[PDB]
Curated annotation (Swiss-Prot):
Tissue distribution: Plasma.
Role this protein plays: Binds water, Ca(2+), Na(+), K(+), fatty acids, hormones, bilirubin and drugs. Its main function is the regulation of the colloidal osmotic pressure of blood. Major zinc transporter in plasma, typically binds about 80% of all plasma zinc. Major calcium and magnesium transporter in plasma, binds approximately 45% of circulating calcium and magnesium in plasma. Potentially has more than two calcium-binding sites and might additionally bind calcium in a non-specific manner.
Modified-residue entries (N6-methyllysine), positions: K530
Binding site for (4Z,15Z)-bilirubin IXalpha: K236
Protein name (record): Albumin
Outcome when changing E350K: In Hiroshima-1
Modification sites for Phosphothreonine: T79, T416, T418
Organism: Homo sapiens
Family matches, as InterPro entries: ALB/AFP/VDB, Serum_albumin-like, Serum_albumin/AFP/Afamin, Serum_albumin_CS, Serum_albumin_N
Effect of H63A: Impairs metal binding
Residue numbers binding Zn(2+): H63, H243, D245
Length: 578
């Protein structure tokens, strides 16, 4: 029995959590109650398998068990139409069907939260259903959320209420901690959505290189043969979590944590503090540990990779192992480089050996490779230096707007909502990285951008409208950022035509938070640029500056919100003039 295996290892608590998350991620539109029921029916069954390891179907794979369970509600096409088809399938892939049907942008209503007085009550009354509901909402809205981590976020979520409801000012104690979690959770999800994207669209060889480079940065002292071991295990963990095998992902992740703590002295010296605490905390800890100090006396890379005369020889023997060592050797001594720049250098190195080694005299050919690294390295450096300077003078809001105009002109076909979301995130790099020393700036900024950009790519892949996004997204994982930076302004785009409703005015905007107020303004700017791509430079103020004036004059007016229907007609008149 397998369900028995995972049960004994994870226990009742975690085993129940993970399955809920698994179910929540597959049927994101299915109600909380139903998931709970199935989860329990599924848990009960597990209990029997523990005792009798051959009872009913205890001999089955989680795939069949989980699959049939869900299919007891999926056949209801009137609710989950396209799902029923999945259930009519077999073993080899009644699952691939499910995996392929995860929605990255569910049509799930916004999740507003009740006053601090209700949450605390509902929490205290039933501490179990309260947390269960949390995971449900998160995992159903983030189908790729790294499960093992979600449990961690859960433990904290609980501790937030456990402490705050016992304060003097609950709203004061809670609200903050809750915001802090809402953010960190969205980040952790984006970060992980990339990892699954890598594996799924580029293959594991891609995810592996990324791991080697990142880990080598964190553990400089670690010897290649050790890193490789970590990368190999690490890969599987993530390979499982993305395919939807949550339980084994959680198991294997734990084992990896155990290992890394046992051989501490062989890996990093900053792992101590991590290995002295509760599993879940220990896992989240090592995963975000700072890089260890760089080994004192280290030889030069040119030695064994460009000057040696056996290069091509070794490259032919085990190219994969050779390049892996190159990356590892170049990354360990370069924690000031972004993971994607490292992977770019590596790719540039491999491409070179390929053409060079088949030459009349290799050494002479690949002798000046490091000369072609120089550009590759400086490009990001300048980009960062430039965009941080700007960010500094305009502030986040004004900076985001800039990027809004910019990207919209780059790929005008993209849907406004997406352009807005992406642009905003892209602007959050300023505050998140610009305040760092150049030594830590590049890895911070460019690797963050790889996350943001993938968001735009997955969202786009749903309904492809721009080949230019399709190209940059699909041609190279490591080159996406540079690929987008290279785009200027589409010369084939044909300006949209005005038709009121596209942007409706309902006075309802006077109640939304300050944030959703900016957002409505930005959504406007995008719509503007789509209607007047060319005519625009910084004359892109003549309307927004006035766009501001507009809003300021109808929420404060005593009129019944009519000005909104009338006035809105006056600014449109002035706008067109410019
Ligand atoms: C103590 C055992 C933890 C195993 C682990 C690890 O090393 N990284 C990890 C680190 C670098 C590259 C790839 C994976 N991730 C991880 C995943 C998502 C995330 O946002 C943070 C970290 C892991 O889950």
């Amino acid at each position: 029995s397998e369900v028995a295996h995972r049960f004994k290892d994870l226990g009742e608590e975690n085993f129940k959590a993970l399955v809920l998350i698994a179910f929540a991620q597959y049927l994101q539109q299915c109600p909380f109650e139903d998931h709970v029921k199935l989860v329990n029916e599924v848990t009960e069954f597990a209990k029997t398998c523990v005792a009798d390891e051959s009872a009913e179907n205890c001999d089955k794979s989680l795939h069949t068990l989980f699959g049939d369970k869900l299919c007891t509600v999926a056949t209801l096409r009137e609710t989950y139409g396209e799902m029923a088809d999945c259930c009519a399938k077999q073993e080899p892939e009644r699952n691939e069907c499910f995996l392929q049907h995860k929605d990255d942008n569910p049509n799930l209503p916004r999740l507003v939260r009740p006053e601090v007085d209700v949450m605390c009550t509902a929490f205290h009354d039933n501490e179990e259903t309260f947390l269960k509901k949390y995971l449900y909402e998160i995992a159903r809205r983030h189908p790729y959320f790294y499960a093992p981590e979600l449990l961690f976020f859960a433990k904290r979520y609980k501790a937030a209420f456990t402490e705050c409801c016992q304060a003097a000012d609950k709203a004061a104690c809670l609200l903050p901690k809750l915001d802090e979690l809402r953010d960190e959770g969205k980040a952790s999800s984006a970060k992980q959505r990339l990892k699954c994207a890598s594996l799924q669209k580029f293959g594991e060889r891609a995810f592996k290189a990324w791991a080697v480079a990142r880990l080598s940065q964190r553990f400089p002292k670690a010897e290649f043969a050790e890193v490789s071991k970590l990368v190999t295990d690490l890969t599987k963990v993530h390979t499982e979590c993305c395919h939807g095998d949550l339980l084994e992902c959680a198991d294997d992740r734990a084992d990896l944590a155990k290992y890394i703590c046992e051989n501490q002295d062989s890996i990093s010296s900053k792992l101590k503090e991590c290995c002295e605490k509760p599993l879940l905390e220990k896992s989240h800890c090592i995963a975000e540990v700072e890089n260890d100090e760089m080994p004192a006396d280290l030889p030069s890379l040119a030695a064994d990779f460009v000057e040696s005369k056996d290069v091509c020889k070794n490259y032919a023997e085990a190219k994969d192992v050779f390049l892996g060592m190159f990356l590892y050797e170049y990354a360990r001594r370069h924690p000031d480089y972004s993971v994607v720049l490292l992977l770019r250098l590596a790719k540039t190195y491999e491409t070179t050996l390929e053409k060079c080694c088949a030459a009349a005299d290799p050494h002479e050919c690949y002798a000046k490779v490091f000369d072609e690294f120089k550009p590759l390295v400086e490009e990001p450096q300048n980009l960062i230096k430039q965009n941080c300077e700007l960010f500094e003078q305009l502030g986040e809001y004004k900076f985001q707007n800039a990027l809004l105009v910019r990207y919209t002109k780059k790929v005008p076909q993209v849907s406004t909502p997406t352009l807005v979301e992406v642009s905003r995130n892209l602007g959050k790099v300023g505050s998140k990285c610009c305040k760092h020393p150049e030594a830590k700036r590049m890895p911070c900024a460019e690797d963050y951008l790889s996350v943001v950009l993938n968001q735009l790519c997955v969202l786009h892949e749903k309904t492809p409208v721009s080949d230019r996004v399709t190209k940059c997204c699909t041609e190279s994982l490591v080159n996406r950022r540079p690929c987008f930076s290279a785009l200027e302004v589409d010369e084939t785009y044909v300006p949209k035509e005005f038709n009121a409703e596209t942007f409706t005015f309902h006075a309802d905007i006077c109640t939304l938070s300050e944030k959703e107020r900016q957002i409505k303004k930005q959504t406007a700017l995008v719509e503007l640029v789509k209607h007047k791509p060319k005519a625009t430079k910084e004359q892109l103020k003549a309307v927004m500056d006035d766009f501001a004036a507009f809003v300021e004059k109808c929420c404060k007016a005593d009129d019944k919100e009519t000005c909104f229907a009338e006035e809105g007609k006056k600014l449109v008149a002035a706008s067109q003039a410019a």
